[PDB]
Amino acid sequence: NPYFAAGGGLMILGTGLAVARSGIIKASRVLYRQM
């Protein structure tokens, strides 16, 4: 399809993994000091 030329889904994946990294970092920041 002509939409394949854009191929902007990698931006979505990058935002998703960045948010996941931030959330996991905050969790581990709480996990160590919780147990």
Added chain:
Amino acid sequence: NPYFAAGGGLMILGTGLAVARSGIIKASRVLYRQM
């Protein structure tokens, strides 16, 4: 594969090395004043 046209992994590597640089800078900021 058609996914090679995008080639967005360099963004992932850049984010990883930037985070590593920040973490190492903070560590050295603690390492000098710890020992």
